[PDB]
Amino acid sequence: HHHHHGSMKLIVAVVQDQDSNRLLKTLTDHNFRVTKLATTGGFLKSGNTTFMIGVEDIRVNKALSLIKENGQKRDQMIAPVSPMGGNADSYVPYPVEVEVGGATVFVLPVDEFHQF
Amino acid sequence: HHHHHGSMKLIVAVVQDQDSNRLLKTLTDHNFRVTKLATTGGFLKSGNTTFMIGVEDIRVNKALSLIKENGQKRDQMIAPVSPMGGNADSYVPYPVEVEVGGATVFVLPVDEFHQF
């Protein structure tokens, strides 16, 4: 049998808080419609921002190019086991550092789009 | 080659806070299952509510009709540049007004649905 999807895509982009306001302004200035979700990174257990951007298929590439050009790689660290916290500040000799990328982006197919 | 999707759909509906409790009650009263996300509108930079509703394909239209009948258009304004806020109250001669719709809704295909 046979199926298709609609003309809209749903972009889900996880970005760093430090890059969020910058991205949001660029997107809405370019007439993109955005919903923002306050999220937490699973590895760093720290706040980040997820943007949900429903876009016509013909504008997906422009949205992606704005997201790509917006962000910056940053180094962050995993928070040590915190029962003693007043010394964990003092510690970590070999910080578990990770590089956080500008954006992790999913472009999802959409069966139906409605504005009610 | 050939693929299909499952019988479930994932409805993602962005609604106004003022209409949220009303919608939620209607949905769960009609045996729909709902997860609520506290979100922010990208343009107004204000709180709104996103409902995630996983629905059998055969009940999608009923869910959509409840969402459609629930909401109301409302006017809102963009908050002016706030460094001086004590006068921004005083200002805005030509308020940038927008009309917020009852619901923006995405119906997503789902490859697998599991209840563990």
Place this chain on the structure above:
Amino acid sequence: HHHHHGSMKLIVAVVQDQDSNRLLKTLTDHNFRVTKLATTGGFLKSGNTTFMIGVEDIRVNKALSLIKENGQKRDQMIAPVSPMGGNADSYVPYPVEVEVGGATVFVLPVDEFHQF
């Protein structure tokens, strides 16, 4: 006409807060990448946790098996009408109890995946 989707899937898993930290540790220990959303159950009107896990199709089953083995069924109750709250504590003779499952999981197709 003809379409396909990409090799990535987006897993959306709604779990209980009591099982969240346990699941997160297991997932990231197994090299899965996770974004966490603080959500609310529509029926219980209480906090729960939604994990968004973008996974290569070839690792989906492993992710699902970790999610499945992680959770536990728990009983919860619907909060009574609260205008008098100081007696609603006193009340509810026939508590509306529900069984909350370990995880409700959607595996979504993904058209494009980008790391910028």
